[PDB]
Amino acid sequence: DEEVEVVLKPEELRIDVMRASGPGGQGVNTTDSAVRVVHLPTGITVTCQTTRSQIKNKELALKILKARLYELERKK
Amino acid sequence: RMKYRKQQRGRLKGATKGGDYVAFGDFGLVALEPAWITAQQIEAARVAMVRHFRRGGKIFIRIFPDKPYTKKPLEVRMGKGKGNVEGYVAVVKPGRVMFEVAGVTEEQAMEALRIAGHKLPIKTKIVRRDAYDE
Amino acid sequence: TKNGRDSQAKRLGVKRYEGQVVRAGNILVRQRGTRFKPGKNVGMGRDFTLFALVDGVVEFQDRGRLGRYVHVRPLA
RNA sequence: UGAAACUCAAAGGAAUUGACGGGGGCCCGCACAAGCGGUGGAGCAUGUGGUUUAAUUCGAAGCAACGCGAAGAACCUUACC
RNA sequence: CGGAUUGGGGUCUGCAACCCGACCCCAUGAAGCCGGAAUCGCUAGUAAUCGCGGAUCAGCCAUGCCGCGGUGAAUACGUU
RNA sequence: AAUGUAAAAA
RNA sequence: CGCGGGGUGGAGCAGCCUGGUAGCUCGUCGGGCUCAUAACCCGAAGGUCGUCGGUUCAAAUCCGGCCCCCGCAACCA
RNA sequence: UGAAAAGCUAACCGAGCCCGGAGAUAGCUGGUUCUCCCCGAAAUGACUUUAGGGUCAGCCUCAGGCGCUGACUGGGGCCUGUAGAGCACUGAUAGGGCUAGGGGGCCCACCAGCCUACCAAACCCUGUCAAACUCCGAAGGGUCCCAGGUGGAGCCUGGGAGUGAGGGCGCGAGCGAUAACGUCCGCGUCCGAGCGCGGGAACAACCGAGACCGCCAGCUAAGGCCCCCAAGUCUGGGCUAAGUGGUAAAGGAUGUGGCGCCGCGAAGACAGCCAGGAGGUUGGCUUAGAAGCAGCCAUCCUUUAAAGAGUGCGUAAUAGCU
RNA sequence: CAGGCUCUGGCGACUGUUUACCAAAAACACAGCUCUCUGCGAACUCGUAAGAGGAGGUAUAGGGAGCGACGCUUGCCCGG
RNA sequence: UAGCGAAAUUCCUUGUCGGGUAAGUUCCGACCUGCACGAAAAGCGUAACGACCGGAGCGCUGUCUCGGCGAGGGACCCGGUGAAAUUGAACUGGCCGUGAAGAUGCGGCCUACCCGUGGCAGGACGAAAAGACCCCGUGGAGCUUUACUGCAGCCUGGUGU
RNA sequence: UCCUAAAAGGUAACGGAGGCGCCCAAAGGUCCCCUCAGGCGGGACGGAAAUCCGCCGGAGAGCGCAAGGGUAGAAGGGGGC
RNA sequence: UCAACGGAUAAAAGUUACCCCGGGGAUAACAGGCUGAUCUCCCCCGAGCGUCCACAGCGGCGGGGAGGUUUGGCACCUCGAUGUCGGCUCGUCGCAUCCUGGGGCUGAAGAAGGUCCCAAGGGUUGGGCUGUUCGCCCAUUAAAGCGGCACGCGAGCUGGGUUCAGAACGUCGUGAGACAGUUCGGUCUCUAUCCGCCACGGGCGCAGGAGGCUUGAGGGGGGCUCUUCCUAGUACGAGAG
RNA sequence: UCCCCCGUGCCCAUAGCGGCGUGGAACCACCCGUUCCCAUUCCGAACACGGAAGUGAAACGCGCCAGCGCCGAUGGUACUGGGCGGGCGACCGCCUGGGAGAGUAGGUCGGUGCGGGGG
Ligand SMILES: [Mg+2]
Ligand SMILES: [Mg+2]
Ligand SMILES: [Mg+2]
Ligand SMILES: [Mg+2]
Ligand SMILES: [Mg+2]
Ligand SMILES: [Mg+2]
Ligand SMILES: [Mg+2]
Ligand SMILES: [Mg+2]
Ligand SMILES: [Mg+2]
Ligand SMILES: [Mg+2]
Ligand SMILES: [Mg+2]
Ligand SMILES: [Mg+2]
Ligand SMILES: [Mg+2]
Ligand SMILES: [Mg+2]
Ligand SMILES: [Mg+2]
Ligand SMILES: [Mg+2]
Ligand SMILES: [Mg+2]
Ligand SMILES: [Mg+2]
Ligand SMILES: [Mg+2]
Ligand SMILES: [Mg+2]
Ligand SMILES: [Mg+2]
Ligand SMILES: [Mg+2]
Ligand SMILES: [Mg+2]
Ligand SMILES: [Mg+2]
Ligand SMILES: [Mg+2]
Ligand SMILES: [Mg+2]
Ligand SMILES: [Mg+2]
Ligand SMILES: [Mg+2]
Ligand SMILES: [Mg+2]
Ligand SMILES: [Mg+2]
Ligand SMILES: [Mg+2]
Ligand SMILES: [Mg+2]
Ligand SMILES: [Mg+2]
Ligand SMILES: [Mg+2]
Ligand SMILES: [Mg+2]
Ligand SMILES: [Mg+2]
Ligand SMILES: [Mg+2]
Ligand SMILES: [Mg+2]
Ligand SMILES: [Mg+2]
Ligand SMILES: [Mg+2]
Ligand SMILES: [Mg+2]
Ligand SMILES: [Mg+2]
Ligand SMILES: [Mg+2]
Ligand SMILES: [Mg+2]
Ligand SMILES: [Mg+2]
Ligand SMILES: [Mg+2]
Ligand SMILES: [Mg+2]
Ligand SMILES: [Mg+2]
Ligand SMILES: [Mg+2]
Ligand SMILES: [Mg+2]
Ligand SMILES: [Mg+2]
Ligand SMILES: [Mg+2]
Ligand SMILES: [Mg+2]
Ligand SMILES: [Mg+2]
Ligand SMILES: [Mg+2]
Ligand SMILES: [Mg+2]
Ligand SMILES: [Mg+2]
Ligand SMILES: [Mg+2]
Ligand SMILES: [Mg+2]
Ligand SMILES: [Mg+2]
Ligand SMILES: [Mg+2]
Ligand SMILES: [Mg+2]
Ligand SMILES: [Mg+2]
Ligand SMILES: [Mg+2]
Ligand SMILES: [Mg+2]
Ligand SMILES: [Mg+2]
Ligand SMILES: [Mg+2]
Ligand SMILES: [Mg+2]
Ligand SMILES: [Mg+2]
Ligand SMILES: [Mg+2]
Ligand SMILES: [Mg+2]
Ligand SMILES: [Mg+2]
Ligand SMILES: [Mg+2]
Ligand SMILES: [Mg+2]
Ligand SMILES: [Mg+2]
Ligand SMILES: [Mg+2]
Ligand SMILES: [Mg+2]
Ligand SMILES: [Mg+2]
Ligand SMILES: [Mg+2]
Ligand SMILES: [Mg+2]
Ligand SMILES: [Mg+2]
Ligand SMILES: [Mg+2]
Ligand SMILES: [Mg+2]
Ligand SMILES: [Mg+2]
Ligand SMILES: [Mg+2]
Ligand SMILES: [Mg+2]
Ligand SMILES: [Mg+2]
Ligand SMILES: [Mg+2]
Ligand SMILES: [Mg+2]
Ligand SMILES: [Mg+2]
Ligand SMILES: [Mg+2]
Ligand SMILES: [Mg+2]
Ligand SMILES: [Mg+2]
Ligand SMILES: [Mg+2]
Ligand SMILES: [Mg+2]
Ligand SMILES: [Mg+2]
Ligand SMILES: [Mg+2]
Ligand SMILES: [Mg+2]
Ligand SMILES: [Mg+2]
Ligand SMILES: [Mg+2]
Ligand SMILES: [Mg+2]
Ligand SMILES: [Mg+2]
Ligand SMILES: [Mg+2]
Ligand SMILES: [Mg+2]
Ligand SMILES: [Mg+2]
Ligand SMILES: [Mg+2]
Ligand SMILES: [Mg+2]
Ligand SMILES: [Mg+2]
Ligand SMILES: [Mg+2]
Ligand SMILES: [Mg+2]
Ligand SMILES: [Mg+2]
Ligand SMILES: [Mg+2]
Ligand SMILES: [Mg+2]
Ligand SMILES: [Mg+2]
Ligand SMILES: [Mg+2]
Ligand SMILES: [Mg+2]
Ligand SMILES: [Mg+2]
Ligand SMILES: [Mg+2]
Ligand SMILES: [Mg+2]
Ligand SMILES: [Mg+2]
Ligand SMILES: [Mg+2]
Ligand SMILES: [Mg+2]
Ligand SMILES: [Mg+2]
Ligand SMILES: [Mg+2]
Ligand SMILES: [Mg+2]
Ligand SMILES: [Mg+2]
Ligand SMILES: [Mg+2]
Ligand SMILES: [Mg+2]
Ligand SMILES: [Mg+2]
Ligand SMILES: [Mg+2]
Ligand SMILES: [Mg+2]
Ligand SMILES: [Mg+2]
Ligand SMILES: [Mg+2]
Ligand SMILES: [Mg+2]
Ligand SMILES: [Mg+2]
Ligand SMILES: [Mg+2]
Ligand SMILES: [Mg+2]
Ligand SMILES: [Mg+2]
Ligand SMILES: [Mg+2]
Ligand SMILES: [Mg+2]
Ligand SMILES: [Mg+2]
Ligand SMILES: [Mg+2]
Ligand SMILES: [Mg+2]
Ligand SMILES: [Mg+2]
Ligand SMILES: [Mg+2]
Ligand SMILES: [Mg+2]
Ligand SMILES: [Mg+2]
Ligand SMILES: [Mg+2]
Ligand SMILES: [Mg+2]
Ligand SMILES: [Mg+2]
Ligand SMILES: [Mg+2]
Ligand SMILES: [Mg+2]
Ligand SMILES: [Mg+2]
Ligand SMILES: [Mg+2]
Ligand SMILES: [Mg+2]
Ligand SMILES: [Mg+2]
Ligand SMILES: [Mg+2]
Ligand SMILES: [Mg+2]
Ligand SMILES: [Mg+2]
Ligand SMILES: [Mg+2]
Ligand SMILES: [Mg+2]
Ligand SMILES: [Mg+2]
Ligand SMILES: [Mg+2]
Ligand SMILES: [Mg+2]
Ligand SMILES: [Mg+2]
Ligand SMILES: [Mg+2]
Ligand SMILES: [Mg+2]
Ligand SMILES: [Mg+2]
Ligand SMILES: [Mg+2]
Ligand SMILES: [Mg+2]
Ligand SMILES: [Mg+2]
Ligand SMILES: [Mg+2]
Ligand SMILES: [Mg+2]
Ligand SMILES: [Mg+2]
Ligand SMILES: [Mg+2]
Ligand SMILES: [Mg+2]
Ligand SMILES: [Mg+2]
Ligand SMILES: [Mg+2]
Ligand SMILES: [Mg+2]
Ligand SMILES: [Mg+2]
Ligand SMILES: [Mg+2]
Ligand SMILES: [Mg+2]
Ligand SMILES: [Mg+2]
Ligand SMILES: [Mg+2]
Ligand SMILES: [Mg+2]
Ligand SMILES: [Mg+2]
Ligand SMILES: [Mg+2]
Ligand SMILES: [Mg+2]
Ligand SMILES: [Mg+2]
Ligand SMILES: [Mg+2]
Ligand SMILES: [Mg+2]
Ligand SMILES: [Mg+2]
Ligand SMILES: [Mg+2]
Ligand SMILES: [Mg+2]
Ligand SMILES: [Mg+2]
Ligand SMILES: [Mg+2]
Ligand SMILES: [Mg+2]
Ligand SMILES: [Mg+2]
Ligand SMILES: [Mg+2]
Ligand SMILES: [Mg+2]
Ligand SMILES: [Mg+2]
Ligand SMILES: [Mg+2]
Ligand SMILES: [Mg+2]
Ligand SMILES: [Mg+2]
Ligand SMILES: [Mg+2]
Ligand SMILES: [Mg+2]
Ligand SMILES: [Mg+2]
Ligand SMILES: [Mg+2]
Ligand SMILES: [Mg+2]
Ligand SMILES: [Mg+2]
Ligand SMILES: [Mg+2]
Ligand SMILES: [Mg+2]
Ligand SMILES: [Mg+2]
Ligand SMILES: [Mg+2]
Ligand SMILES: [Mg+2]
Ligand SMILES: [Mg+2]
Ligand SMILES: [Mg+2]
Ligand SMILES: [Mg+2]
Ligand SMILES: [Mg+2]
Ligand SMILES: [Mg+2]
Ligand SMILES: [Mg+2]
Ligand SMILES: [Mg+2]
Ligand SMILES: [Mg+2]
Ligand SMILES: [Mg+2]
Ligand SMILES: [Mg+2]
Ligand SMILES: [Mg+2]
Ligand SMILES: [Mg+2]
Ligand SMILES: [Mg+2]
Ligand SMILES: [Mg+2]
Ligand SMILES: [Mg+2]
Ligand SMILES: [Mg+2]
Ligand SMILES: [Mg+2]
Ligand SMILES: [Mg+2]
Ligand SMILES: [Mg+2]
Ligand SMILES: [Mg+2]
Ligand SMILES: [Mg+2]
Ligand SMILES: [Mg+2]
Ligand SMILES: [Mg+2]
Ligand SMILES: [Mg+2]
Ligand SMILES: [Mg+2]
Ligand SMILES: [Mg+2]
Ligand SMILES: [Mg+2]
Ligand SMILES: [Mg+2]
Ligand SMILES: [Mg+2]
Ligand SMILES: [Mg+2]
Ligand SMILES: [Mg+2]
Ligand SMILES: [Mg+2]
Ligand SMILES: [Mg+2]
Ligand SMILES: [Mg+2]
Ligand SMILES: [Mg+2]
Ligand SMILES: [Mg+2]
Ligand SMILES: [Mg+2]
């Protein structure tokens, strides 16, 4: 069989927010849109701060942590 | 299902037609308060009921969700919500009969019909069947 | 999101009510199809409009399966 | 100018006989050319490959295996089931 | 033309002809109108063609094989 | 108008 | 969240604008040349046209929604 | 002019300084001065390179003309598709009956049949949903006639305007998330302009009320009458023990009061308390094990006045205590 | 009065130049390479013009452009 | 293409591996899925040179653990002269409410004799500058081009000299 | 065109849904005639659906195109002029 | 297809980080506010897991709520200016408690731990990397809490980042230029009037004038912790502890 | 005044569907034929013309039946102009005037105007 999505279960990973880096002006300053999802069970992590939206950034990080975590488990 | 598209909200004025009487079954569950009950909420109660009396009698579901549930993806104002995020719901007004159980003992109907009441966003009540018919 | 359309209101309906004097040939009812039929001294135009052919008063009459009629009961 | 580790039981010269050459010369065989009829198409017969089967006995394999052992498989024959 | 296939009826061998014989008669009457790429045989009494016999063997699935005679051509400039 | 591995000489 | 383009035999492409007929190449399968395989020659088979719905007499072809691929775009604070 | 920064060209150079055109233009901002008296708006609609500007209409006001017509109201007549409800049309829908097509087995090859604790059209009964569904359908609104209605009513011509950001509240909808001092319409209302007066501690729009001036008079409105603070520590009957009142939800609990139905009890109840509390049985089935007592299936009789094929703990499984 | 030294990357060869008054640099400039115009009343620039510069120079010269010591090198495409 | 490559170019990214360190999002070596190097807007390399930018080590130290003391010129006090920006008027307190949603000024409560001097910077949405950002105006200006139209310049036929 | 739109008319939002920028010398005028969709049964090719006959079948057809209103006591189908 | 359909010309596109004027809190960016979807925490139900056993410990499907740290919605004061990240200095408040204190339960022998309840008094280290916040890491600790105060604090400081003018890379654009892409550079204003605060005086008062010596209403400061030794190698445990 | 039939209008299902019975003397239908008037996308089916014989089968008139369709109260509730109160709300309650849809009881196989022939 298979195992993929079972891992995206919340209590396993940890999501941090924080101010972005580089350009944004006063926006980047007082607006934290940096996101970093760490997958505690494996420690493997991805961080993202491309867009201006914390929600669109959390959305992305998750979607990439998936694929990385999926390959690890696939190799296993 | 089929219908068409997205539908206006509309209010939930007095529980006039909001209600009924026990159709089938030994007992049932009535809504004391108006609300939109979600698809999920419904199934939640159902599966609960069965899980309680495994290999059990018969659960009826007098209510049914056909109102589309619109919602916006965390934005502002162009167009109407792509909606359907919780999906669909049923207009339950005070009085309505929502679930009928049959083919079980009271202590089973009472318990199960109660457990279901815990999934519903509403104050509820469990009825025997008096006799009032038509 | 395409939908902002509509046509302008056509403002139609009965224009003169039952028991109302009418001059030579003034309009009495503007209707979508044949919600109403002609009658005594009451013809109708292309758009199914209903107008007086003589003076006098307007009276309505329901003829069931037949239809709803409107006519002018003249006097002079 | 000029090594080593490592590794092989050879590497190699000239000459000999033979086979081969999209090298040559001379020469032959229904080899091609000339010419007549014919398989490959169809139906059926017969052998073979394959698949199938309880078994479908086995051998023969380009030319030089395939109407070939079989110049006579109803049971005999018959090696198979 | 061609005679495959199928039905029906019958003879003979052999203890026995469902699987599996051969033949007869009636009926049934198939594809096929000269065959893609490719390929076989034969240089004169030869090819083509037409029959007859024999081995085997009860009978025969022989159009097979071995042999016999009858009618009887074409074409080889040349060796690239 | 290319290529045919890898076990044969008292 | 936007805008644009596309999902067609096993592979890659055509056909859709301007509805009736799904074509091209390789590959696949049968046969041939060869001692044999490749090449080459002869013959053949193979496609629910992303899925759900609509318009039509008729939908790969037109219209609407979902799904997947590609291209752009996401600025001032 | 510049070994290039758009650098420098008399202390500010993306085109210097002075003077002139000149009172450029400025649909923008600011400012606009004595007194009293009557009336008193608007923040809508249509079009607009229009949206913080205009044009017309609407609403204000003056002058002249008209004379019961105006709002509102009584009666009567017509038009209407809403709230409600309904399922007859369009669709939606849960359960069952019935029954085409599909699934899956026995039974097959000649195709046929028989089952089906499956999927399911049509049809039926049961039960239900719908802004863009209606067999039906109000209250109400609209308009004509007749009457009441002399009002800072109404109508006609004409001079003068301002206004074209509106805001909150109640109600009826869309949007929104049955969020927002959110938004967008409809009806009304108050603020705007009544930031004048009483109430709400304070507070445009909530409740009360429309300030011509004066009064060391009087009644009342909302609200309030224990003190700050006017006025009852008023009367009578209940409830609450939380400082609830002095401002939170599912959900919970032998808080307390009141009504009601059910059953038990002087042939002795509820509680507590003494005795048994049993027999085939160790119920049958699974499970390594499964002894009322994991999980699955379930309804015997006997000793009796009594004791469940069993309530909960407990042992590996017992016994045990209950 | 009067250098802290060393190792190792990036940019720019190098001395120079620059935003007088927030930028001295990896920016400009540079020697040097290549393309291109120009036969002399030159091309090019300023000027309505006369005229002037170019140059009292003549293709080893003069204008324009890009690259920027030096070393190695600098591929394919001429549809628009 | 050569060459070069997580780069003054790498989003994911602190990419992975190695060096340095006790520990390295930087640095340096290496690999190459180069979002988005690449060959005169030159590619790669290069001795020397640089008040250019990065990493490291030695040396040395009030940079620091973490401060102390001390000197002079102010600041303080007296004599002489004596400004400024700002300024509706002031008799100008704390909390919790409150209000146009951040109150010395309203409500309630609490605290408080009158006036100065030295010192601090939390508030007075403190001063300064009719917000540079952003939008609006059928405002302006500098700049570009295969935006429109025009002019210089140039080319060109006809004709005059 | 329909809904929102609160049973007069009107009525907003970057509210919900769909069309138009045509076409027809017959798809026009008139006179006469004619009445569908669909369901069951019967029928050679047909075949769920051509055409034929029977019965039931008030409008669920049709009206060039979106939608609504209307509509067979014709606006629908045919003919003569 | 005057289709921007009441149609400005017959005839028209970009760019400005070199920029400028008039205006607007009528309108964005910061902050506050309203709201609380997102966020953080708590709770109801109890399928199920934990040998047996729903809460020692845990909790599917779904439900209710608190808080106002994040992301966001709206556009209400503020565009005749409310300076914006980080660090530094100085802090102070909450408690949903990181440590020390107290306590119930435990699948608590002991030691150690799990989890809930009470409890702010005080405490809550030093360095590497990066502008960083955040985070990873080194070495320690009783512990290395979270959060409010305009994400406290620029008339206190810094100015690495972020937001001017220069220059460059990639990159888009014919171009001028452009980029929550990078890279190097780049001017933070001596005087405090009022409130508040830290100190120190002058005046008057305290119903005789004076020198000295006290009372304490009210208030303020401080409130941290570890390790080893004894009790005892005792209780406990097979032992290791 | 009455009854039968014929043509026509009105109310527009309580008139209709189906079931059963009934009349041809007059009326009406069908029936006879298609020369003529005229007619079929083909058929005298239909429309049209001449016309006895036959018939009440079909159609139609009349009447009885309720099974279907259609009509359908009363009481009561929903909702609701106007007035007032309550919950943060989603909402709820009172007063005054109005008041359905559904379902129930029950009704219905019609009623009537004019003209004409017939006893
Ligand atoms: Mg989970
Ligand atoms: Mg940065
Ligand atoms: Mg930038
Ligand atoms: Mg920028
Ligand atoms: Mg923000
Ligand atoms: Mg923030
Ligand atoms: Mg970013
Ligand atoms: Mg982006
Ligand atoms: Mg593992
Ligand atoms: Mg919901
Ligand atoms: Mg926005
Ligand atoms: Mg029962
Ligand atoms: Mg029962
Ligand atoms: Mg519940
Ligand atoms: Mg509940
Ligand atoms: Mg309950
Ligand atoms: Mg009932
Ligand atoms: Mg609209
Ligand atoms: Mg309309
Ligand atoms: Mg409109
Ligand atoms: Mg409309
Ligand atoms: Mg070596
Ligand atoms: Mg031969
Ligand atoms: Mg020979
Ligand atoms: Mg030959
Ligand atoms: Mg042949
Ligand atoms: Mg053959
Ligand atoms: Mg063979
Ligand atoms: Mg087989
Ligand atoms: Mg053998
Ligand atoms: Mg063999
Ligand atoms: Mg043989
Ligand atoms: Mg015979
Ligand atoms: Mg022939
Ligand atoms: Mg023989
Ligand atoms: Mg022979
Ligand atoms: Mg090979
Ligand atoms: Mg090989
Ligand atoms: Mg070999
Ligand atoms: Mg394609
Ligand atoms: Mg597509
Ligand atoms: Mg594709
Ligand atoms: Mg296709
Ligand atoms: Mg393909
Ligand atoms: Mg495929
Ligand atoms: Mg296409
Ligand atoms: Mg072979
Ligand atoms: Mg063939
Ligand atoms: Mg072929
Ligand atoms: Mg398709
Ligand atoms: Mg097709
Ligand atoms: Mg992009
Ligand atoms: Mg800017
Ligand atoms: Mg810009
Ligand atoms: Mg200069
Ligand atoms: Mg000067
Ligand atoms: Mg200056
Ligand atoms: Mg200058
Ligand atoms: Mg200028
Ligand atoms: Mg002026
Ligand atoms: Mg103007
Ligand atoms: Mg007045
Ligand atoms: Mg306007
Ligand atoms: Mg008068
Ligand atoms: Mg009236
Ligand atoms: Mg229906
Ligand atoms: Mg149904
Ligand atoms: Mg079937
Ligand atoms: Mg079947
Ligand atoms: Mg079976
Ligand atoms: Mg079946
Ligand atoms: Mg039936
Ligand atoms: Mg029914
Ligand atoms: Mg029924
Ligand atoms: Mg109706
Ligand atoms: Mg009905
Ligand atoms: Mg009715
Ligand atoms: Mg009157
Ligand atoms: Mg307006
Ligand atoms: Mg308004
Ligand atoms: Mg609101
Ligand atoms: Mg006031
Ligand atoms: Mg208040
Ligand atoms: Mg006011
Ligand atoms: Mg007021
Ligand atoms: Mg009094
Ligand atoms: Mg009173
Ligand atoms: Mg009392
Ligand atoms: Mg009392
Ligand atoms: Mg209280
Ligand atoms: Mg309770
Ligand atoms: Mg109780
Ligand atoms: Mg016992
Ligand atoms: Mg036992
Ligand atoms: Mg026992
Ligand atoms: Mg047990
Ligand atoms: Mg024991
Ligand atoms: Mg045991
Ligand atoms: Mg026991
Ligand atoms: Mg010296
Ligand atoms: Mg020196
Ligand atoms: Mg030294
Ligand atoms: Mg230099
Ligand atoms: Mg270089
Ligand atoms: Mg020098
Ligand atoms: Mg110079
Ligand atoms: Mg300088
Ligand atoms: Mg200057
Ligand atoms: Mg300057
Ligand atoms: Mg320098
Ligand atoms: Mg320069
Ligand atoms: Mg040069
Ligand atoms: Mg060179
Ligand atoms: Mg030349
Ligand atoms: Mg010039
Ligand atoms: Mg010139
Ligand atoms: Mg000269
Ligand atoms: Mg090149
Ligand atoms: Mg190349
Ligand atoms: Mg080219
Ligand atoms: Mg060319
Ligand atoms: Mg060319
Ligand atoms: Mg390469
Ligand atoms: Mg790296
Ligand atoms: Mg570099
Ligand atoms: Mg790293
Ligand atoms: Mg390392
Ligand atoms: Mg990527
Ligand atoms: Mg490239
Ligand atoms: Mg180039
Ligand atoms: Mg270069
Ligand atoms: Mg170098
Ligand atoms: Mg330098
Ligand atoms: Mg220098
Ligand atoms: Mg040294
Ligand atoms: Mg050092
Ligand atoms: Mg000193
Ligand atoms: Mg001093
Ligand atoms: Mg002084
Ligand atoms: Mg003071
Ligand atoms: Mg003050
Ligand atoms: Mg006051
Ligand atoms: Mg002072
Ligand atoms: Mg002094
Ligand atoms: Mg201060
Ligand atoms: Mg002050
Ligand atoms: Mg300040
Ligand atoms: Mg301004
Ligand atoms: Mg314009
Ligand atoms: Mg300009
Ligand atoms: Mg051109
Ligand atoms: Mg060109
Ligand atoms: Mg020109
Ligand atoms: Mg010329
Ligand atoms: Mg000329
Ligand atoms: Mg309409
Ligand atoms: Mg309306
Ligand atoms: Mg409407
Ligand atoms: Mg209303
Ligand atoms: Mg209305
Ligand atoms: Mg409505
Ligand atoms: Mg209406
Ligand atoms: Mg809507
Ligand atoms: Mg046209
Ligand atoms: Mg015609
Ligand atoms: Mg039938
Ligand atoms: Mg048939
Ligand atoms: Mg058919
Ligand atoms: Mg048929
Ligand atoms: Mg109809
Ligand atoms: Mg309508
Ligand atoms: Mg229609
Ligand atoms: Mg219609
Ligand atoms: Mg017609
Ligand atoms: Mg326009
Ligand atoms: Mg235009
Ligand atoms: Mg710009
Ligand atoms: Mg720039
Ligand atoms: Mg720049
Ligand atoms: Mg520049
Ligand atoms: Mg400028
Ligand atoms: Mg300005
Ligand atoms: Mg605002
Ligand atoms: Mg909340
Ligand atoms: Mg949450
Ligand atoms: Mg809670
Ligand atoms: Mg539960
Ligand atoms: Mg339970
Ligand atoms: Mg378990
Ligand atoms: Mg589950
Ligand atoms: Mg979960
Ligand atoms: Mg929930
Ligand atoms: Mg919730
Ligand atoms: Mg607003
Ligand atoms: Mg000011
Ligand atoms: Mg200021
Ligand atoms: Mg503790
Ligand atoms: Mg312990
Ligand atoms: Mg940085
Ligand atoms: Mg630390
Ligand atoms: Mg914040
Ligand atoms: Mg905050
Ligand atoms: Mg801050
Ligand atoms: Mg500063
Ligand atoms: Mg700062
Ligand atoms: Mg700071
Ligand atoms: Mg600096
Ligand atoms: Mg930096
Ligand atoms: Mg900086
Ligand atoms: Mg600048
Ligand atoms: Mg380019
Ligand atoms: Mg980007
Ligand atoms: Mg930098
Ligand atoms: Mg510098
Ligand atoms: Mg100083
Ligand atoms: Mg100071
Ligand atoms: Mg004194
Ligand atoms: Mg004193
Ligand atoms: Mg004390
Ligand atoms: Mg203290
Ligand atoms: Mg010891
Ligand atoms: Mg010991
Ligand atoms: Mg000891
Ligand atoms: Mg012991
Ligand atoms: Mg031991
Ligand atoms: Mg020990
Ligand atoms: Mg008489
Ligand atoms: Mg008479
Ligand atoms: Mg009549
Ligand atoms: Mg008769
Ligand atoms: Mg006859
Ligand atoms: Mg005839
Ligand atoms: Mg005749
Ligand atoms: Mg005649
Ligand atoms: Mg005649
Ligand atoms: Mg005729
Ligand atoms: Mg005819
Ligand atoms: Mg005749
Ligand atoms: Mg008769
Ligand atoms: Mg009859
Ligand atoms: Mg009849
Ligand atoms: Mg009824
Ligand atoms: Mg009633
Ligand atoms: Mg009422
Ligand atoms: Mg009311
Ligand atoms: Mg009242
Ligand atoms: Mg309230
Ligand atoms: Mg009714
Ligand atoms: Mg009924
Ligand atoms: Mg009837
Ligand atoms: Mg009848
Ligand atoms: Mg009569």
Coordinates of N, CA and C in Angstrom, one line a residue, chain B residues 39-51:
Chain B
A39 N -24.1 19.6 5.8 CA -24.0 18.2 5.4 C -23.2 17.5 6.5
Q40 N -22.0 17.9 6.7 CA -21.1 17.3 7.7 C -21.8 17.1 9.0
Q41 N -22.4 18.1 9.5 CA -23.1 18.0 10.8 C -24.1 16.8 10.7
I42 N -24.9 16.7 9.7 CA -25.8 15.6 9.5 C -25.1 14.2 9.6
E43 N -24.3 13.9 8.6 CA -23.5 12.7 8.6 C -22.9 12.4 10.0
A44 N -22.4 13.5 10.7 CA -21.8 13.3 12.0 C -22.7 12.6 12.9
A45 N -23.9 13.0 12.9 CA -24.9 12.4 13.8 C -25.2 11.0 13.4
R46 N -25.5 10.8 12.1 CA -25.8 9.5 11.5 C -24.8 8.5 12.0
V47 N -23.6 8.6 11.4 CA -22.5 7.6 11.7 C -22.4 7.4 13.2
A48 N -22.7 8.5 14.0 CA -22.6 8.4 15.4 C -23.6 7.4 15.9
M49 N -24.9 7.5 15.4 CA -26.0 6.7 15.8 C -25.7 5.3 15.5
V50 N -25.3 5.0 14.3 CA -25.0 3.6 13.9 C -23.9 3.1 14.9
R51 N -22.8 3.8 15.0 CA -21.6 3.3 15.7 C -22.1 2.9 17.1

